[PDB]
Amino acid sequence: GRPILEVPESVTGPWKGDVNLPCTYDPLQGYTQVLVKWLVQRGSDPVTIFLRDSSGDHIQQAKYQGRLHVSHKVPGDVSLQLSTLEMDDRSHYTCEVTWQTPDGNQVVRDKITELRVQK
């Protein structure tokens, strides 16, 4: 009855290749997606690397500009697409989605995945 994010616990991608960090949900009648964020935690707290809002897509660090995109064509698929994987891309990533609900309130869900980089 309420949106459920589907995010694998871990993903392995090839060093200097590409990989997707899946994040999907089945769209529910009467829910409106209003925000998507991807975060990474290389240090002590998660930091935002990507935001999609009413003005579109915003990449928050230069090292991702040209390497990071987020799925958009299929409703409910907000997977993160990373190209030229670096060893330093190994980390825990968080997918966070915000919806407006039929009653007018907003609800937020998130889920964490680990990216492993394989030589």
Q: Which CATH superfamily is domain 1-119 in?
A: Immunoglobulins (2.60.40.10)
Among 80, 75, 1, which residue's Cα sits nearest to residue 32? 75
Strand-by-strand arrangement of the 47-53 sheet: 10-14, 106-118, 91-100, 32-40, 47-53, 56-59
| C-alpha distance from residue 59 to each of 1, 32, 63, 106 (Å) | 32, 22, 9, 24
Task: Name the residue ranges covered by the structural domains of the chain.
Answer: 1-119
Among 47, 36, 49, which residue's Cα sits nearest to residue 7? 36
CA-based diameter of the chain, in Å? 49
Distance CA 111, CA 9 (A): 9
DSSP 73-96: SSTTB--EEE-S--GGG-EEEEEE
Tracing tokens 């409910």 back to the chain, one arrives at 76
Determination technique for this entry: X-ray
Name the resolution in angstroms.
Answer: 1.2
DSSP letter, residue 64: G
